[PDB]
Design a protein around this ligand. Structure first.
Ligand SMILES: Nc1ncnc2c1ncn2[C@@H]1O[C@H](CSCC[C@H](N)C(=O)O)[C@@H](O)[C@H]1O
Ligand SMILES: Nc1ncnc2c1ncn2[C@@H]1O[C@H](CSCC[C@H](N)C(=O)O)[C@@H](O)[C@H]1O
Ligand SMILES: O=CNc1ccccc1
Ligand SMILES: O=CNc1ccccc1
Lengths: 257, 268
């Protein structure tokens, strides 16, 4: 909690979204894998609606590239002001914004609709209506008078819960808290680190709860979801770089029931 | 009739050709806007991609005829030919290609075209890889004059005969008349092996275009004049499509009415 007060957005982006982890040319990397999970899921046509909320967006937007063409009202969120600012810089095309164009290009490539990456970014920027503070530790993560339409038709969340929870039970409650934001019958797309215990963001050294695939599945069931899909990416040696001790990445497609 | 005079005018006029103006006029927006699928850029790239996707156009060696300062016309080709020769009449164009080959920052930026080719080829290739492969496969950049019976000269470096030819907006842009156009086509055809393929892209019913201070004269040709010249030169026409230039893409840089793409196979 106080650890996140030293969290440096630029250090985080450099660590996870610039080469090598940010090289998208090799389809066997973690970046293409993530984008693929997202794209394939939305391509089913079963994840749809009017409103969507991204939970713990941090300073990144890649997690919404495939989502944005299925949801007209999108809400992005984060605990930290500095992350919300970094997002605003990209949404408003302000100076020094992070360059997400390689990810936008690869989403267009993967989706296979012949869309140009500029149109994709345009649609995302237009459909993200707001960027709000959030704390998944709170029973009402967004607060009381939320400007965000509730409940949402769908949730997305990448690398938040395990990264803000000291242990399983805390992870489980955090999942409980965000689930209240989701309409019954709605969809949650959850991405996260597997068996990770720490990662770095500049001066910040963050603690993570190491979770397994089966622990993720069980937590989803406990929270009232049917697990439609749960896949694992094993982190290859050359992508183990000293910025963390992640062993793999999970993708879960869950439906509130 | 005597050919020298018309050829002399053409060579003279091209001494004023400005590569950067030409690039801005034709390969930056609006004509360089690749987001609109109905634009001329995506159409050209589509013709090339679909043709190479048939698998029917392959071999070891390819020659691009009148490359000028552009490389888009080879984006889909480069995965099918180990050895690629680029060519142009003007040293200033060859220099511009030199800059791109060295990946210099001052070079024209073709990355939107590279990305779009990757997008429509549908193999999930990243654009950095496409560009790296093109740079690796261009083995030489050579002077050329299509009005000469041997356009590359005698004892040229180029592997002859080639398995395939590509040529975009060259023949009609350097030929004073239809007879000249036909002869130019005859000349480049000597470079292609029997059974080899020619991919020809060009302007329809155009009489002029701008390249900075240079305002050049073009022989206006129709689709049926293009088909006949190809037949006359000893080709079977496999494909010949027409793009009609939208009014919003008529920017005053030329009086082009449309664009043709011909896929032709040399009889042999
Ligand atoms: N108590 C809390 N409630 C909700 N989000 C929190 C939180 N404490 C930290 N966060 C945010 O959780 C994020 C983890 S980083 C994940 C970044 C992005 N979602 C991605 O896909 O790369 C950080 O941005 C951090 O600021
Ligand atoms: N006598 C000649 N023989 C072969 N090419 C010539 C020529 N005279 C001029 N050219 C070249 O013909 C080109 C026409 S511009 C077209 C350039 C490029 N292939 C494209 O696709 O946009 C110019 O580069 C010009 O220098
Ligand atoms: O630790 C969390 N961030 C992370 C982001 C992308 C890939 C692997 C880890
Ligand atoms: O050369 C004149 N017209 C032209 C039109 C589109 C692309 C290249 C050239």
């Amino acid at each position: 909690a106080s650890a996140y007060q030293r969290f440096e957005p630029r250090a985080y982006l450099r660590n996870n979204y610039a080469p090598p982890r940010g090289d998208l040319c090799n389809p066997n990397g973690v970046g293409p894998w993530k984008l693929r999970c997202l794209a394939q899921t939305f391509a089913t046509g079963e994840v749809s609606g009017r409103t969507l909320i991204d939970i713990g967006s941090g300073p990144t937007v890649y997690q919404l590239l495939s989502a944005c063409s299925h949801f007209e009202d999108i809400t992005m969120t984060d605990f930290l002001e500095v992350n919300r600012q970094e997002l605003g810089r990209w949404l408003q095309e302000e100076p020094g914004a992070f360059n997400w164009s390689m990810y936008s290009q690869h989403a267009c490539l993967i989706e296979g609709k012949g869309e140009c990456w500029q149109d994709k970014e345009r649609q995302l920027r237009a459909r993200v209506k707001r960027v709000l503070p959030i704390d998944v530790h709170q029973p009402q993560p967004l607060g009381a008078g939320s400007p965000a339409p509730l409940p949402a038709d769908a949730l997305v969340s990448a690398f938040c819960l395990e990264a803000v929870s000291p242990d399983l039970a805390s992870f489980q409650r955090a999942l409980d808290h965000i689930t209240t934001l989701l309409r019954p019958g709605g969809h949650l797309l959850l991405i996260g680190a597997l068996e990770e215990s720490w990662y770095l963001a500049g001066e910040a050294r963050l603690t993570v709860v190491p979770v397994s695939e089966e622990e993720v599945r069980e937590a989803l069931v406990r929270s009232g979801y049917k697990v439609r899909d749960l896949r694992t990416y094993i982190m290859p040696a050359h992508l183990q770089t000293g910025v963390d001790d992640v062993k793999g990445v999970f993708f879960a497609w869950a439906q509130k029931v």
